[PDB]
Amino acid sequence: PLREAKDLHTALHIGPRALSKACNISMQQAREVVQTCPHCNSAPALEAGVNPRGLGPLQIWQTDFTLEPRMAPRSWLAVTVDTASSAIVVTQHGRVTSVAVQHHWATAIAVLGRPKAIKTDNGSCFTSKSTREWLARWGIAHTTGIPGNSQGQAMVERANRLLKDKIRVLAEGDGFMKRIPTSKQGELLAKAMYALNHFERGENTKTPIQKHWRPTVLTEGPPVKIRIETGEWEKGWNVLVWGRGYAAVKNRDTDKVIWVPSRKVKPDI
Amino acid sequence: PLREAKDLHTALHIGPRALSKACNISMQQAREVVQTCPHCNSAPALEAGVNPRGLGPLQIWQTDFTLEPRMAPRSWLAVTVDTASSAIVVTQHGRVTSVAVQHHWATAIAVLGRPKAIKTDNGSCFTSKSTREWLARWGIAHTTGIPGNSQGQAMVERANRLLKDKIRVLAEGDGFMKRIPTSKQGELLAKAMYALNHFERGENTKTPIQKHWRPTVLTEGPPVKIRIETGEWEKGWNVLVWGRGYAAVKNRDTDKVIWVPSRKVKPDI
Amino acid sequence: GPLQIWQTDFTLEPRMAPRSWLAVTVDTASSAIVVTQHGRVTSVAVQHHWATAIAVLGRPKAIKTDNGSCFTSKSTREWLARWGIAHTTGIPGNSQGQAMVERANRLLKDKIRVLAEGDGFMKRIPTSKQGELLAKAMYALNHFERGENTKTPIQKHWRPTVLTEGPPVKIRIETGEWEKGWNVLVWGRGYAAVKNRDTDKVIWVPSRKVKPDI
Amino acid sequence: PLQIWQTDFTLEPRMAPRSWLAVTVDTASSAIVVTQHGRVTSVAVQHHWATAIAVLGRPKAIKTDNGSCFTSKSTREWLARWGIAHTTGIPGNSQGQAMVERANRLLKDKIRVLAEGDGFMKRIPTSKQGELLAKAMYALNHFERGENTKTPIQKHWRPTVLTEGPPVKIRIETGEWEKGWNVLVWGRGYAAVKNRDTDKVIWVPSRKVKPDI
Amino acid sequence: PRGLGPLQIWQTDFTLEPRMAPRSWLAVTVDTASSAIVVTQHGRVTSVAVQHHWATAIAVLGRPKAIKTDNGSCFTSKSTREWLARWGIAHTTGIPGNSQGQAMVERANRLLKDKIRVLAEGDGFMKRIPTSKQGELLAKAMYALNHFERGENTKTPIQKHGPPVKIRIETGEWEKGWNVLVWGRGYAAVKNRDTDKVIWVPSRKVKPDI
Amino acid sequence: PRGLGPLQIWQTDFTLEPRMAPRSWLAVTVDTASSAIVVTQHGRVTSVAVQHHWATAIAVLGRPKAIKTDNGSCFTSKSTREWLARWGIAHTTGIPGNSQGQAMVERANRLLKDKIRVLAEGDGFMKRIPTSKQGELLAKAMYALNHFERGENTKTPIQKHGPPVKIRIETGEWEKGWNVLVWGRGYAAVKNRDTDKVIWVPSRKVKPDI
Amino acid sequence: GLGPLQIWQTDFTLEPRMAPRSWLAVTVDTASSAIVVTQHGRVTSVAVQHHWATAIAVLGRPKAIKTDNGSCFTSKSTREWLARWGIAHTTGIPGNSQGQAMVERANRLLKDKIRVLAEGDGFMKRIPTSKQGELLAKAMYALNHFERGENTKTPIQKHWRGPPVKIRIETGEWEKGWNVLVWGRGYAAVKNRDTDKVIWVPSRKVKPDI
Amino acid sequence: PRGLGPLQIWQTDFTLEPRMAPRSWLAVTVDTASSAIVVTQHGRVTSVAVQHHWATAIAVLGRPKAIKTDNGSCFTSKSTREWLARWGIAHTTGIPGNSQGQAMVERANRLLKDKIRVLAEGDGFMKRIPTSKQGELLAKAMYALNHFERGENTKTPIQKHWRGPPVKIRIETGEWEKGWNVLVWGRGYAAVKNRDTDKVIWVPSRKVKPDI
DNA sequence: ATTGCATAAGACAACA
DNA sequence: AATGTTGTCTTATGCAAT
DNA sequence: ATTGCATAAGACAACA
DNA sequence: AATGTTGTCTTATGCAAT
């Protein structure tokens, strides 16, 4: 008897379990009477497409700025990370002036080389006329994320947090609770550099530096199963890289490389 | 060779994995050299004891106010929940004044009975002198949570969100997108009351109203394994109530009733 | 049995201006009294009353009343049919459709004044204390005793007991046989504690090893 | 590589006020590093190789002159802390400072080239000094000098591009772990592995896999 | 910069071109707002050459509301006057070369001539261009000067002439009334229903309605 | 039959109209998705006439990618073939009269002839057009078929110049005629071809159409 | 009040219970409410000295004593007693609001206890010579170590009178300079390192130091 | 044997000090755990003087759950037992001069005698003191006894009035040293304090081990 | 054995 | 002074049918 | 088998 | 315009030894 069930949901908007228990009704009718109400199901599907990444070294770079209280009066720091190799370059400045980014990138070029693209937020001086003109003169791409979410640059942001942690560790292990003397600024910065780039982090068996200078890229990945957008796993692609977080896959015919979350891919057979 | 490892950590603050890999050392020495540094571990233990609850019906109650735009010009609602049986009573008022608070409780009292304790946030009118003296005249307790965390009354707040959801569903499922005519307010409130109290919510097989008027309480719990704060699981207590969220366990000789995180208990033998 | 027949009428209360019209709903099997008040005798106000009375007490099976203008009006009629309750009318004052309504009315009319003199209000309580007075009167009439029995209407209505045991479930034994005579106590994750209905012996058992009984 | 380094402090008037220029050069790769200095100090002494170490690594020995800030106890203690072997020399000797000749020459050449290339003749703007230094650094390190078949970077880092995972032994059905295999991808509980000869990729559980040697 | 929209005010004039000889005459219709152009071809000045001009002009870029002209004799001719009477668009006179009537058409003639000379030297014709190449050369000049933006502007001269979702805001609510235009891998652009404007929002910040 | 997008597919044919003597050899070219009709008059079939109409047609519609034509000694001639190569446009020549591709161009030719007729006898030129009137009458008929109407469409051609899935209803059947514009993790956003209405349908209630 | 053992208020009162030695000697501490009463049936320098010191004996050494201008309170013997005691003496009417009134209220409560205890034992106004000290001392016990009022700590606990942690604040930072006094099962009261002020905080908003 | 608890058991006896004359008699009460002593120095010995001493003693210090005194006619009076019933405190009696609970009382009485004598000789009275300064001598002696520490003992009689388990910690050397009682214990580490230095440090939960 | 199902286990969000 | 909660949703799993 | 260990797998946070 | 990331930590598991 689902007529009283329909009336009960319409006049009361009752959950399926109670509807089943209150009118001697079972699984099915409970479901297809509870989904009829549009008001009972509005939100519960929010898509999550989460995938920035580059493939090879000196392809995609990220950049943000940091306010470091210990670095007074030169608190502002510009941090740059190579997405492929996770190497880090930072420099110290006093203003957010475009000239600082001019210098910071120039040093970053000298240490790592010339990348192809640089992703960054729409900072007050990142999109400045002089900055864009000089960047074009150097001849490298520039792509700003969505204007307002400091989350598309998650790699440089996490590297920022990590660098702040490391520099504070060194400073307050050197006996400086509040701030660093102007003398020790460069020594702290360079020691942090050598600590981070030249020593592997976490559990990966690869140092960031020899990751950068000795990159490994697969020319032909292994077959995998792919949660193609239609909703179900499909067979017949190969994963290029499968990071701890997220992965890149390649077609067998179209040879497309796309960045998808690791949940969308599982190994073949 | 742990001398260079000690130097490397002291001057450089390296993770145990890299220290082990960079000085030909292993598990132990890497550990007890990385924990020597006080700066390598500061936060990573934040205690979380999360347990407000009552035992029997009409023992502990909670209360909060709600601003509901659809209920204009009488938007303010007073919500009361019995923590034991999760019954809800809501009354409508125009101001948060103490007199409104006076009105709300006795209406709830006439429906559920007389409780003993009413936890609430330190509202401007809950602690008012008239409210306090009138409550003492009725003669039941009054306990305020910590002054500022609207999180210790989490039950009334969650029931608040649920009630707002239900009233929204009823309102816009009837053809009132933005607000409600004065002629519809009372019957909307009454239908919302009837829906939640007299019907199942989620998967529990016991109606809140028949939980309140026909409660079941165990006089002697079954043996369990208890994470006494001593570090590990102590054997020799019995759980009284084990909610999906959290549980209460009893001593076998001290006869103590304690509200404990559910992760701290597991079945005995 | 409880919750089979209800009763309803109005009552003019001059002590309660300007909202001087009061509605009373009474159960028959338990004599549980539910009241709500409205300034004007229209439809919308009195179905608000019936909705509140249903919410506080539940859904009855039949409602008997007078032949008042609204009581048989359409709005009320299809509202009640959608609710699925059997309406009943009668002589406006007959001793059958209004057998207990007038008794409840006189009880309430005594209680309201009793309390008004209790807080020293003679002519008309201010609009602020009307709801509090009504709630206090409802609590006094319902949860207490005015008869000479050992069961309050709440004790009559909800069958209020204090259980000690959970629902019975048929546990499976290691040989693979389902076995009733067992009642669960605690639904802990993975393991549920179930007690032997005879020996009062509890035991921890995996979740899928037990199924509900009957 | 990362064996012996040299250094010197050289003047130049165009970057006033911080006209003091520090140099450090490797032998096996001839890599260069340069830092500005307002004035030569034993502390600024510290500031240079710390930067130099980060970009190149930790060498095995360093040779220099007997400079005032080169010989104070601060530098000695710091190099001892890092465990690097100092070896002083004559302020101008060739048996010691030998690559720094080519270094200084090329550095001054490139600095002049860029300073006149960007429309300046006698004083770089104070905001534009580090730009020119970094540009000279990149040009002299990532580009071959003269006949050099490789840039300093190629010699220093051997920047090859491998394409195969490390040698790894996989638990065979007899229980043993046969070597000669290389992992390709570390998935969830499964790691695709190839044979170095058959070139066949196979998914194997993460419990049966362990590295070679 | 007048605030009036397109298709409102026109301007007409002819020009001379020895390159296009013997069909050495050309005319262009320009808008004060859009600055869009239509080019015809003729070898003699006639009241019907403008008629060929107007018919080509009105068809490509819609109907004009008002046209400002000069005191040419053929512009008041009986044939073109009957043509304009059939059209329904007013005709205005003036002085030949003021700043209020002849505002941009002369400079448009000069720019069109400069384009025709530069393209003629690009494809290899200095003195004159044969009548066979005129059509494609004029088409190329038109496409370069119309399909491509010239100078600086927020929109090209040709530009001058969705299922409903709920997105978050900084407040934290879920406002309604937008429609997604493009569905990116992890981003989206949504157009408001009332303020009909497009804003880019990450995929993890939007949910639908109904 | 309706195309996929403007400025990506083209088609052409040859027409002769005795009233346009001696330049009676027209050159019709129409789009498929955008259905834009353009012609250019000449007085013989030749590589010269073909490349002149085509180059003129390039800038009046848009830079071409691949145009489908018919067989003959003009498109297949060496000069026009190298013209196709130089302009980066392919060839898909078929039967001279194939039903799959030339029925639409033949219908367009009939429409063009009928419009030229109707407008010419509306003006007062019945049988044949003089020299000074040919361009004006061609422009007149084109104007009649630029921005008024096409004859049946609610979305005119030059105004325009999801895979199919089966959905579910409460009835008990899986109905087709729906293409998903937008896909969600717990629903789909499909739109019908006819109603062109977008509705959020749960992912359970859809499955591929063939 | 701020700290105990700081301000002492001694006054004399008459209770007809222990007549003919009906005079009393009582001292009140403002910041602790601790009370000493020594029976003294004659207001004299010896009696006030004996009770004053017995007041110190019961509780401890003060820093000052506030009394009135009674001739038995500023006598040379009393002045020398205070001088060799090294404490301060201030006169009064008495009857001020903030001070010299808590002594009267404490006398009222002390006698309240003596009357209730006497009527519990069975004496109305006159008590035996072996009962005056008993009644007064029983009243001291009842009033002192049994909480009176609406406090959580008894008056004697109101008499004389952790590891460092980092707490989060509304900003989200984690500041130092804090210590834990009481450790609840899900809550904690924290005291500042410098201000030494105690506030409570959820146990989930604190992490330790070093 | 002092791990019973403060404000639990009290011991009372009479000692006749040679300086209180002519009000020679004195009733003394002591606490086993709190080490807190209060006296009144009456001029007579009897049950009325006993309970006047007793009832001021309990007001000064706290509420014992038991008060113990040597058997005799000076404490078994019916008025004393009515007093006890009015206060509901259990009572027991022992040998008048046994070592069960009276050696501490005897040493406390001797300490009172010595402190009183030294204070009197400091003031200037060698043998006898006027009846006006007896109380001040008593108050000064009580302040010395209670507030200030007696002997090398760190815990003053105050500290044992209204007041974690011992544990051993893990040292880098190899010593599970004692002298540590956790104050606030978390799930990652603890907050221990020493017993003598009384300094608070945070040590990992793997760095600790209980005592006995 | 494979597929499908009925359930259980686990995750997410938001309440001034 | 006095501490998160839980409906809703999603994925995983074992059984039952096939 | 019981304990411990060596490992793997999973969870939290914060960065203008 | 153009999308979270991962080091650090905790818990669980299995094997190897006892």
Ligand SMILES: CCN1C[C@H](C)n2c(c(O)c3c(=O)n(Cc4ccc(F)c(Cl)c4)nc(C(=O)NC)c32)C1=O
């Ligand atoms: C003093 C009068 N007063 C309130 C202060 C203004 N307040 C009151 C509230 O009812 C709330 C409230 O509901 N929530 C929502 C909330 C946030 C997080 C949770 F975990 C849960 Cl359980 C609830 N927040 C606050 C607040 O201000 N800061 C979080 C709040 C209130 O009544």
Ligand SMILES: CCN1C[C@H](C)n2c(c(O)c3c(=O)n(Cc4ccc(F)c(Cl)c4)nc(C(=O)NC)c32)C1=O
């Ligand atoms: C306009 C110029 N501009 C910035 C706006 C002001 N901004 C900038 C930043 O660098 C940050 C930033 O780092 N974070 C920290 C953060 C917060 C959450 C995350 F998920 C991640 Cl990865 C990072 N937040 C902001 C911000 O907008 N609101 C919190 C932000 C910036 O450079």
Ligand SMILES: [Mg+2]
């Ligand atoms: Mg930023």
Ligand SMILES: [Mg+2]
């Ligand atoms: Mg940022």
Ligand SMILES: [Mg+2]
């Ligand atoms: Mg609140």
Ligand SMILES: [Mg+2]
């Ligand atoms: Mg709230």
Ligand SMILES: [Zn+2]
């Ligand atoms: Zn619904």
Ligand SMILES: [Zn+2]
């Ligand atoms: Zn460290």
